[PDB]
Amino acid sequence: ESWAQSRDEQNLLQQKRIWESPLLLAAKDNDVQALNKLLKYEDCKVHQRGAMGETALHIAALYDNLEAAMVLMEAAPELVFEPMTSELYEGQTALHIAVVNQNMNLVRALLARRASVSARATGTAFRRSPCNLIYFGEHPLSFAACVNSEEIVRLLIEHGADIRAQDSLGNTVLHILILQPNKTFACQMYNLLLSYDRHGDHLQPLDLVPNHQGLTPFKLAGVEGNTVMFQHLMQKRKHTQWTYGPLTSTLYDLTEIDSSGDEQSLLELIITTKKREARQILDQTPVKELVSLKWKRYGRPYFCMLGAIYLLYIICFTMCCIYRPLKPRTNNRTSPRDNTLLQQKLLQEAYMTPKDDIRLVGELVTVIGAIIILLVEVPDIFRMGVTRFFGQTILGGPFHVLIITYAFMVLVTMVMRLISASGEVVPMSFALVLGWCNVMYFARGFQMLGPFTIMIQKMIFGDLMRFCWLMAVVILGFASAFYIIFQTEDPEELGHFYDYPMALFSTFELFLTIIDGPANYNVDLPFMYSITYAAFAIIATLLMLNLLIAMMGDTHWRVAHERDELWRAQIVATTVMLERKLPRCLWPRSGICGREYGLGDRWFLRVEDRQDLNRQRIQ
Amino acid sequence: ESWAQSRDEQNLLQQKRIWESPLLLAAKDNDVQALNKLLKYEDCKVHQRGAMGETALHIAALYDNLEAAMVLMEAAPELVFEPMTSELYEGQTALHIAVVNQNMNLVRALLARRASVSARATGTAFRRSPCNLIYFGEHPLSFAACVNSEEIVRLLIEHGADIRAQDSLGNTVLHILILQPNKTFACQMYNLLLSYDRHGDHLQPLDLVPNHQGLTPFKLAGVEGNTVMFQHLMQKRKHTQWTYGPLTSTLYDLTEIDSSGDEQSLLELIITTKKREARQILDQTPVKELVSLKWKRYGRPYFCMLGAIYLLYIICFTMCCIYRPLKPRTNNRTSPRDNTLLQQKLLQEAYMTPKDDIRLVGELVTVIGAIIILLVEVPDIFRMGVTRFFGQTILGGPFHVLIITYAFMVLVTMVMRLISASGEVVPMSFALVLGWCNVMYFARGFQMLGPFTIMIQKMIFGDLMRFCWLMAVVILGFASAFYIIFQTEDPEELGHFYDYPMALFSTFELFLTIIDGPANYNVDLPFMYSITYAAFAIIATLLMLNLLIAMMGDTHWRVAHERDELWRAQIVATTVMLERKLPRCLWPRSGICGREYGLGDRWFLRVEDRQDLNRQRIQRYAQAFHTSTSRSSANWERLRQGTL
Amino acid sequence: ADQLTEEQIAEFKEAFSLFDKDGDGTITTKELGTVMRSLGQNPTEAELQDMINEVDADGNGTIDFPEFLTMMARKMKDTDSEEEIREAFRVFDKDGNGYISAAELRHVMTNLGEKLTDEEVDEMIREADIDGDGQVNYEEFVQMMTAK
Ligand SMILES: CC(C)CCC[C@@H](C)[C@H]1CC[C@H]2[C@@H]3CC=C4C[C@@H](OC(=O)CCC(=O)O)CC[C@]4(C)[C@H]3CC[C@]12C
Ligand SMILES: CC(C)CCC[C@@H](C)[C@H]1CC[C@H]2[C@@H]3CC=C4C[C@@H](OC(=O)CCC(=O)O)CC[C@]4(C)[C@H]3CC[C@]12C
Ligand SMILES: CC(C)CCC[C@@H](C)[C@H]1CC[C@H]2[C@@H]3CC=C4C[C@@H](OC(=O)CCC(=O)O)CC[C@]4(C)[C@H]3CC[C@]12C
Ligand SMILES: CC(C)CCC[C@@H](C)[C@H]1CC[C@H]2[C@@H]3CC=C4C[C@@H](OC(=O)CCC(=O)O)CC[C@]4(C)[C@H]3CC[C@]12C
Ligand SMILES: CC(C)CCC[C@@H](C)[C@H]1CC[C@H]2[C@@H]3CC=C4C[C@@H](O)CC[C@]4(C)[C@H]3CC[C@]12C
Ligand SMILES: CC(C)CCC[C@@H](C)[C@H]1CC[C@H]2[C@@H]3CC=C4C[C@@H](O)CC[C@]4(C)[C@H]3CC[C@]12C
Ligand SMILES: [Ca+2]
Ligand SMILES: [Ca+2]
Ligand SMILES: [Ca+2]
Ligand SMILES: [Ca+2]
Ligand SMILES: [Ca+2]
């Protein structure tokens, strides 16, 4: 936050140093008459600096003064070199400024003066950050390619630029064109920059070299959500086999898309990234048909076998909690005889009958099932991450947590059974509502139940969470109000408010209208009570519970095409998970191989379609 | 599924055989220089095959090489014949490929070489399936008529095509034009193909011969939902009687529309088909006025007499269940004396008083009424079908099942009364809630109650069924959680959860908030209970029951013009049913006959209307001969943003 | 006349229809006489004879639809529309009659949210409705795109 305060003080200081210098002010406006009067002096300070560590030639290039800049090059040719020496604009030469301002005469004048075309603008104002408004690169070829000047790009190559210039991020020129906000004109430059490669043998052509994250220009368009650049890069990876009237048969190349992928492949990059614009690449021409052929053939049957094994697992755990051992109460009821009702307790040496030997089989099914969960899920949490990015995979989210918390509460019950601890009701009653509500994970493979389970999640972290802050405000105010009213009275004719923990639990239920409401009709209630409960029922039942339905009803039609895009991405995340963990004896690799068809060793997927007729008479 | 895997292996193998053959590769690109070097050899394999069983002429026609194809015909004229011999593209000749690619010079070159214009492309890649992207037919005239080339159709007729070519489905040329996805240009070809008939005496003109389902081209447009082809075929079947200013009086022909129909007539084809695009033909020019004249005149009074007979039937059955015989308890209460409350039981020799002789009349009304249901409904289930297509007639759907299940449960009660079985409460208590909720069938003849009964059905098989899978997940988790909490405690001060069948029935009701909630306020409840019930009431009452109202409210305005189209189709299904089962003494035949008016023996329906007078339209086409607002314009920018 | 797209033939087909008020495919001098009197003009009997005989290639004496289609391609005004608009219209039009309706702009607006009353749907129609039948053409649909 204080960096932007410090950056604003730098720009105001630069305007101070220009006005307080007769060279820099004269180079600022144009003052071609004034430069000849100063530069003919003896010590006219040609290597003068400023706040950004700029010279007089940096100023004349920044304010676009061709006439003043040539005078500075004639009187001092050393200023074509010597970039800015500040921390912010480090390394930026005068050639960089003339290219970004898209000047044609000043660039050609600098190239005659032997300018450096391979300098690096490696300051903190050119790096890819949310603080900077631009990410142009580091090299003059990277600057000319992003401001869309095909004249200067052709000019820089003829004077010996490098087509493989990599940044501090490792990005080449072709990576930077993808990160630009103008998608259409980036496609026009992308064809131009490959056209001047044409001799890039190198054992790496041009658009196959990755940056420091291992991403090619094809996969970087997949992560950043460039739908326009993604369709432009599909032209290289398809082959039209035959055209039979209104019927073509293309042949896409699954060598950088399919998740056979010992490297990091494109379906893992899209499904783990946080951008909501990358999930639109799951509807394009090779990827939509690839996922459906995985999900219909091998994705849905293997997901419904894991849905039936888990369902018979959580029935076997349920009947170990129903038939769990109990004995009658040992000592006495003599806990104070008006508020005790428990009459059984837990047994120690439970396994001494044949009916409990069946349950011991059922409990060993449970505990072994609780270890297998902590061996296929925990070595992905402590290994691939230190829990920095585990939370929202896509939006799928809690079912990682609910299956860990289930496997923890089973193993707490194992500890309390071996040491014969007292309360096993608490670790079980978590483990069941965590156990059965995790069956909702398996409702993502059914179109009837799929988009409804997403809307349950988008209300709990949203329109139900913001209501439960303004519910706990109300039922702290009224429950502390109802408590002091019945504090001075008889707690057996109306005992909804005798303890303060009980008065919080009555008013939580009177807000929800699930219990009735305090009324006796035999004894005179306090006169203050009927006032403060009629005040309560209006702003609980008439106002705020009818304002959830107005708010959940308003949300449900607004996010009603987002939850359908979220469901088609939950299938891709499920398919990639089932493909990774299952062995290769099951799940054959997608697409047709090309060894016995004379196409190489890569894997292809053909798609035929009927396009149009109305656009066939005229096309 | 594995067929598409096998079909993809065929196409990659075809590209292998082309590259591995010097003839087929040279015929592929164009290589007119390379063919003269190979074909001058001795054994240059002119009848060479491939994966699709194709020759070099099939390749040159497929990749559109006119120059290479003529060289193959000069060096070997036998290749104009000999179609593909694979299973997939069986029978497809080289003339077929030149027609589909819409080549004009290659077709005329093949016809000079005596090509077969009556060959059949009877492979598995041309049949009408959801697997194939096209259904063009089998004959070259069928191929040229579907790719919209009027030059090649005129060329094929002059060289002796057959205008009555029928497929393996029985479809003629005119049937195939209806099944094409471009409706407007199919109308232009339909006039052309009839124009070249003009001598089709045959005792069958041209567009009256049916396919193997008995459907003419007029009725096939009715089934497939071609609204454009349906209005085009109405031009033949109307007659303008007189035009009196802005007032014309047309005269439609009800010889293939009206369901007098000893054959299968058009109102039965539309109302039984599964397509949702065929129900738009119920709003066209003769059919909308035909249904209304049946429903207003004879459809609604006969449907409200069956609604009053059935209502007095289900009152007579109700009072036989209220006045059913019971005697006091015989032996003892001695079933374990804390959980028994029943104190009457069923009687055996019930009919021994005059008050039960009235009921015996009322029960024989019921049982005879239960046989008549199983004689007018079951001989349509076992006869017209083996229950393959009984389920969704239109969407009407369950009322077939609810009237069979009612007539079954009455006859179960007849068996249990004769053999004097114990529990008659179970077959009755089904038979009443099945009996009275079948009165909702008769709410389709009232516009107030009509479109509301459809929305009850579209929630039960939809937004209520997907909620009851995620309700049974929750009330298995919490009911098994609440059970083990109160398992170790006293089941009379709070006994909502003492059995596991009872704990499932408490938590089903606490989810619905119909019973109150476990609270005693005299004894200390478990500390785990108040945590796990406050967790429960948030995701039952605050979240998921307020998410039905947000979901049923979102659906109700989306399907709000579909349920109005579903109601106008429930009237047509009712009208055709009442017309079929009632005798001909009632229900006179619709329309005016033409015997005593000099029009033949067919039946007509006249419709007069006032059309317009739109000056700006008619003035623009006439010169061609010669020798509220503010938020509307906001909506169009919302469409311009959506289109962009 | 084999240069004409799908939507123009659907416009010209009903344009043929309101000339031909007897339910066939023949424009005699009578039916063009009934039109030109309804325009308020006095049709000269020579003028009625010329306009039929000018475009009648077969020589039967009655203008059918392919001759009315041939004439209208001569006297076509122009259209220079876009690819994105034409592909939008063919998806918007469902039954393929060449016309978007009031029943078919309800489907497009329900597709992207946008709660319209049935009155406000017809309030959208009459803005794009240049000539008037309660339907928007393809020519009127292009007009409501390139206005900005
Ligand atoms: C002794 C026998 C009965 C062992 C039975 C064990 C199974 C019932 C367990 C063991 C491993 C479990 C699986 C381990 C890993 C996962 C992935 C997990 O994925 C998520 O949570 C993704 C959602 C998110 O992104 O948060 C969902 C449950 C699932 C399929 C589990 C389903 C239930 C399984 C098959
Ligand atoms: C939106 C509101 C303003 C319109 C409807 C609300 C009224 C129906 C409520 C609001 C205040 C209520 C009153 C608040 C206080 C009392 C005292 C109350 O007295 C007792 O507590 C009974 C025993 C006793 O102390 O004598 C009897 C009901 C009464 C008159 C209530 C009757 C119902 C009233 C008028
Ligand atoms: C013994 C005396 C009192 C005479 C009683 C006769 C009526 C009460 C019953 C006998 C036969 C019944 C009919 C049998 C068959 C049908 C068709 C049935 O059709 C459907 O269910 C169509 C909707 C769907 O597709 O589900 C609707 C009820 C109806 C008219 C029934 C209405 C009530 C009827 C006329
Ligand atoms: C997302 C939630 C937190 C919405 C905010 C509402 C809270 C104000 C509610 C919800 C959960 C409630 C708690 C759930 C569990 C308990 C334990 C409960 O147990 C006891 O201490 C007494 C013993 C018994 O009740 O049997 C007392 C009420 C209390 C603190 C409740 C007080 C009111 C709470 C904090
Ligand atoms: C289990 C026993 C006791 C009673 C069960 C009642 C069930 C099976 C019955 C009673 C009410 C019935 C529904 C009542 C209303 C409609 C709407 C209608 O347009 C189609 C039939 C439909 C959808 C019925 C389907 C079957 C139904 C749900
Ligand atoms: C306090 C104890 C007894 C009960 C606690 C239950 C809580 C932790 C459990 C039970 C029901 C669960 C929810 C059930 C449904 C969904 C929707 C799904 O798309 C994501 C997970 C999510 C959002 C679960 C989150 C965790 C959850 C709220
Ligand atoms: Ca309520
Ligand atoms: Ca005429
Ligand atoms: Ca003519
Ligand atoms: Ca339309
Ligand atoms: Ca119009």
CSV table of C-alpha atoms in Angstrom, one decimal, chain A residues 215-427:
chain,number,residue,atom,x,y,z
A,215,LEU,CA,4.0,-24.0,-20.4
A,216,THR,CA,4.2,-23.8,-24.2
A,217,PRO,CA,2.3,-21.0,-26.0
A,218,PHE,CA,-0.5,-23.5,-26.7
A,219,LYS,CA,-1.0,-24.3,-23.0
A,220,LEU,CA,-0.6,-20.7,-21.9
A,221,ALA,CA,-3.6,-19.8,-23.9
A,222,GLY,CA,-5.4,-22.7,-22.1
A,223,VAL,CA,-4.6,-21.4,-18.7
A,224,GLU,CA,-5.2,-17.7,-19.3
A,225,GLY,CA,-8.5,-18.2,-21.0
A,226,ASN,CA,-7.6,-16.8,-24.4
A,227,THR,CA,-10.5,-18.4,-26.3
A,228,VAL,CA,-9.4,-16.5,-29.4
A,229,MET,CA,-5.8,-17.6,-29.3
A,230,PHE,CA,-6.9,-21.2,-28.5
A,231,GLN,CA,-8.9,-21.5,-31.7
A,232,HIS,CA,-6.1,-19.9,-33.6
A,233,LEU,CA,-3.6,-22.5,-32.4
A,234,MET,CA,-6.0,-25.3,-33.4
A,235,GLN,CA,-5.2,-24.7,-37.1
A,236,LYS,CA,-1.8,-26.4,-36.7
A,237,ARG,CA,-3.1,-29.5,-34.9
A,238,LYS,CA,-5.9,-30.7,-37.2
A,239,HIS,CA,-6.0,-32.5,-40.5
A,240,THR,CA,-9.0,-32.6,-42.8
A,241,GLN,CA,-9.3,-36.2,-44.1
A,242,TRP,CA,-12.2,-35.9,-46.5
A,243,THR,CA,-15.0,-33.6,-47.5
A,244,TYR,CA,-18.2,-35.4,-48.7
A,245,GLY,CA,-20.7,-32.8,-49.6
A,246,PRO,CA,-21.8,-31.0,-46.4
A,247,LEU,CA,-19.7,-33.4,-44.3
A,248,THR,CA,-16.1,-33.0,-43.3
A,249,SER,CA,-13.9,-35.3,-41.2
A,250,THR,CA,-11.2,-33.6,-39.3
A,251,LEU,CA,-8.5,-35.3,-37.2
A,252,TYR,CA,-7.3,-33.5,-34.1
A,253,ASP,CA,-4.0,-34.1,-32.4
A,254,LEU,CA,-4.1,-35.1,-28.7
A,255,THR,CA,-0.4,-34.8,-28.0
A,256,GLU,CA,-0.8,-31.7,-25.7
A,257,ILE,CA,-4.4,-32.0,-24.6
A,258,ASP,CA,-5.0,-35.6,-23.4
A,259,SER,CA,-4.1,-36.4,-19.8
A,260,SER,CA,-2.0,-39.5,-20.4
A,261,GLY,CA,0.5,-36.9,-19.5
A,262,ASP,CA,3.5,-37.8,-17.5
A,263,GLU,CA,4.1,-34.1,-17.9
A,264,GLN,CA,1.5,-31.5,-16.8
A,265,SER,CA,-1.2,-31.7,-19.4
A,266,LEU,CA,-3.8,-29.2,-20.5
A,267,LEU,CA,-6.8,-30.8,-18.7
A,268,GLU,CA,-5.0,-30.5,-15.4
A,269,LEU,CA,-3.9,-26.9,-16.0
A,270,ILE,CA,-7.5,-25.7,-16.8
A,271,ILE,CA,-9.2,-27.6,-14.0
A,272,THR,CA,-6.8,-26.4,-11.2
A,273,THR,CA,-6.4,-22.7,-12.2
A,274,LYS,CA,-8.5,-20.1,-10.4
A,275,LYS,CA,-9.6,-18.0,-13.4
A,276,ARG,CA,-13.3,-18.2,-14.4
A,277,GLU,CA,-12.4,-17.5,-18.0
A,278,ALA,CA,-10.4,-20.7,-18.4
A,279,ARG,CA,-13.5,-22.9,-18.0
A,280,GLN,CA,-14.7,-21.7,-21.4
A,281,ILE,CA,-12.1,-23.8,-23.1
A,282,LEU,CA,-14.0,-26.9,-22.0
A,283,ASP,CA,-16.5,-26.1,-24.8
A,284,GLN,CA,-14.1,-25.9,-27.7
A,285,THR,CA,-13.7,-28.3,-30.6
A,286,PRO,CA,-11.3,-31.1,-29.5
A,287,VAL,CA,-11.9,-30.8,-25.7
A,288,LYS,CA,-15.7,-31.1,-25.5
A,289,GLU,CA,-15.6,-34.4,-27.5
A,290,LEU,CA,-12.6,-35.7,-25.6
A,291,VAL,CA,-14.3,-35.3,-22.2
A,292,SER,CA,-17.6,-36.9,-23.3
A,293,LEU,CA,-15.8,-39.9,-24.7
A,294,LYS,CA,-14.0,-40.4,-21.4
A,295,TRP,CA,-17.1,-39.8,-19.3
A,296,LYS,CA,-19.7,-41.8,-21.2
A,297,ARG,CA,-17.4,-44.8,-21.8
A,298,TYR,CA,-15.2,-45.2,-18.8
A,299,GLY,CA,-15.9,-42.2,-16.5
A,300,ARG,CA,-19.5,-42.9,-15.5
A,301,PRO,CA,-19.4,-46.7,-14.9
A,302,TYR,CA,-16.3,-46.4,-12.7
A,303,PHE,CA,-17.8,-43.5,-10.8
A,304,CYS,CA,-21.0,-45.4,-10.1
A,305,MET,CA,-19.1,-48.4,-8.8
A,306,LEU,CA,-17.3,-46.1,-6.3
A,307,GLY,CA,-20.7,-44.7,-5.5
A,308,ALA,CA,-22.0,-48.2,-4.6
A,309,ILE,CA,-18.9,-49.4,-2.7
A,310,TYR,CA,-19.0,-46.2,-0.6
A,311,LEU,CA,-22.7,-46.6,0.0
A,312,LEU,CA,-22.3,-50.1,1.3
A,313,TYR,CA,-19.4,-48.9,3.4
A,314,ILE,CA,-21.5,-46.2,5.1
A,315,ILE,CA,-24.3,-48.7,5.8
A,316,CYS,CA,-21.8,-51.1,7.4
A,317,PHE,CA,-20.6,-48.2,9.6
A,318,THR,CA,-24.2,-47.2,10.4
A,319,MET,CA,-25.1,-50.7,11.7
A,320,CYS,CA,-22.0,-50.7,13.9
A,321,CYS,CA,-23.3,-47.5,15.5
A,322,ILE,CA,-26.8,-48.9,16.0
A,323,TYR,CA,-25.7,-52.3,17.5
A,324,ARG,CA,-22.9,-50.6,19.5
A,325,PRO,CA,-22.6,-52.1,23.1
A,326,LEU,CA,-24.5,-50.7,26.0
A,327,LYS,CA,-25.2,-52.0,29.5
A,328,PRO,CA,-27.7,-50.7,32.1
A,329,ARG,CA,-26.8,-48.0,34.6
A,330,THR,CA,-24.5,-49.3,37.3
A,331,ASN,CA,-24.5,-47.3,40.5
A,332,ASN,CA,-27.5,-45.0,41.2
A,333,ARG,CA,-29.8,-42.3,39.8
A,334,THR,CA,-28.6,-40.1,42.6
A,335,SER,CA,-27.4,-37.2,40.4
A,336,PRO,CA,-30.0,-34.6,41.5
A,337,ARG,CA,-33.1,-36.6,40.8
A,338,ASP,CA,-35.1,-34.0,38.9
A,339,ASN,CA,-32.9,-33.5,35.8
A,340,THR,CA,-31.4,-36.9,35.1
A,341,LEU,CA,-32.8,-39.4,32.6
A,342,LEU,CA,-29.9,-41.4,31.3
A,343,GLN,CA,-30.2,-45.1,32.3
A,344,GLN,CA,-27.7,-47.0,30.2
A,345,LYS,CA,-23.9,-46.6,29.8
A,346,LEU,CA,-21.0,-48.0,27.7
A,347,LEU,CA,-19.7,-51.5,28.2
A,348,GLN,CA,-16.0,-52.4,28.5
A,349,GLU,CA,-15.6,-56.1,27.6
A,350,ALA,CA,-18.1,-56.0,24.8
A,351,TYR,CA,-17.1,-59.0,22.7
A,352,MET,CA,-18.3,-62.0,24.7
A,353,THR,CA,-21.3,-63.2,22.7
A,354,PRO,CA,-21.8,-64.6,19.2
A,355,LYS,CA,-23.9,-61.6,18.1
A,356,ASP,CA,-20.9,-59.3,18.7
A,357,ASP,CA,-18.5,-61.4,16.7
A,358,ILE,CA,-20.5,-60.3,13.6
A,359,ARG,CA,-20.1,-56.7,14.6
A,360,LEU,CA,-16.3,-57.1,15.1
A,361,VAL,CA,-16.2,-58.0,11.4
A,362,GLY,CA,-18.2,-54.9,10.6
A,363,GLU,CA,-16.0,-52.6,12.7
A,364,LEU,CA,-12.8,-53.9,11.1
A,365,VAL,CA,-14.4,-53.1,7.7
A,366,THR,CA,-14.9,-49.6,9.0
A,367,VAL,CA,-11.5,-49.0,10.5
A,368,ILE,CA,-9.6,-50.4,7.4
A,369,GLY,CA,-11.9,-48.2,5.4
A,370,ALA,CA,-10.8,-45.2,7.5
A,371,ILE,CA,-7.1,-45.9,6.9
A,372,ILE,CA,-7.4,-46.2,3.2
A,373,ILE,CA,-9.0,-42.8,3.1
A,374,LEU,CA,-6.1,-41.3,5.0
A,375,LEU,CA,-3.6,-43.0,2.6
A,376,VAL,CA,-5.1,-41.8,-0.7
A,377,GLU,CA,-5.9,-38.3,0.4
A,378,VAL,CA,-3.4,-37.2,3.0
A,379,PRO,CA,-0.3,-38.0,0.8
A,380,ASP,CA,-1.7,-35.5,-1.7
A,381,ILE,CA,-2.2,-32.8,0.9
A,382,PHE,CA,1.2,-32.9,2.6
A,383,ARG,CA,3.0,-33.7,-0.7
A,384,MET,CA,1.5,-31.6,-3.5
A,385,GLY,CA,1.3,-28.5,-1.4
A,386,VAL,CA,1.7,-27.4,2.2
A,387,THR,CA,-2.1,-26.7,2.2
A,388,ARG,CA,-1.7,-23.5,0.2
A,389,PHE,CA,-4.0,-24.3,-2.7
A,390,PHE,CA,-6.1,-27.3,-1.5
A,391,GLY,CA,-9.3,-25.3,-0.6
A,392,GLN,CA,-11.1,-24.6,-3.9
A,393,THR,CA,-9.9,-27.1,-6.5
A,394,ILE,CA,-12.6,-25.9,-8.8
A,395,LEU,CA,-15.5,-25.1,-6.5
A,396,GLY,CA,-15.7,-28.8,-5.4
A,397,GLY,CA,-14.2,-27.8,-2.2
A,398,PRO,CA,-15.6,-29.3,1.0
A,399,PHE,CA,-15.6,-33.0,0.1
A,400,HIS,CA,-11.9,-33.1,0.6
A,401,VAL,CA,-12.5,-31.9,4.2
A,402,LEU,CA,-15.6,-34.0,4.9
A,403,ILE,CA,-13.8,-37.2,4.0
A,404,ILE,CA,-10.8,-36.4,6.1
A,405,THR,CA,-13.0,-35.4,9.1
A,406,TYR,CA,-14.9,-38.6,8.7
A,407,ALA,CA,-11.7,-40.7,8.7
A,408,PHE,CA,-10.5,-38.8,11.7
A,409,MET,CA,-13.6,-39.4,13.8
A,410,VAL,CA,-13.6,-43.1,13.1
A,411,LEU,CA,-10.1,-43.3,14.4
A,412,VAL,CA,-11.0,-41.2,17.5
A,413,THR,CA,-13.6,-43.8,18.2
A,414,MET,CA,-11.0,-46.5,17.8
A,415,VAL,CA,-8.8,-44.8,20.4
A,416,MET,CA,-11.7,-44.4,22.9
A,417,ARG,CA,-12.7,-48.0,22.4
A,418,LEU,CA,-9.2,-49.4,23.1
A,419,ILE,CA,-8.5,-47.2,26.2
A,420,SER,CA,-12.2,-47.6,27.2
A,421,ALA,CA,-12.9,-43.9,27.4
A,422,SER,CA,-16.3,-42.6,28.5
A,423,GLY,CA,-18.0,-40.6,25.7
A,424,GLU,CA,-18.1,-42.3,22.3
A,425,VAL,CA,-21.4,-40.6,21.4
A,426,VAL,CA,-19.5,-37.4,20.5
A,427,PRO,CA,-17.0,-38.9,18.0
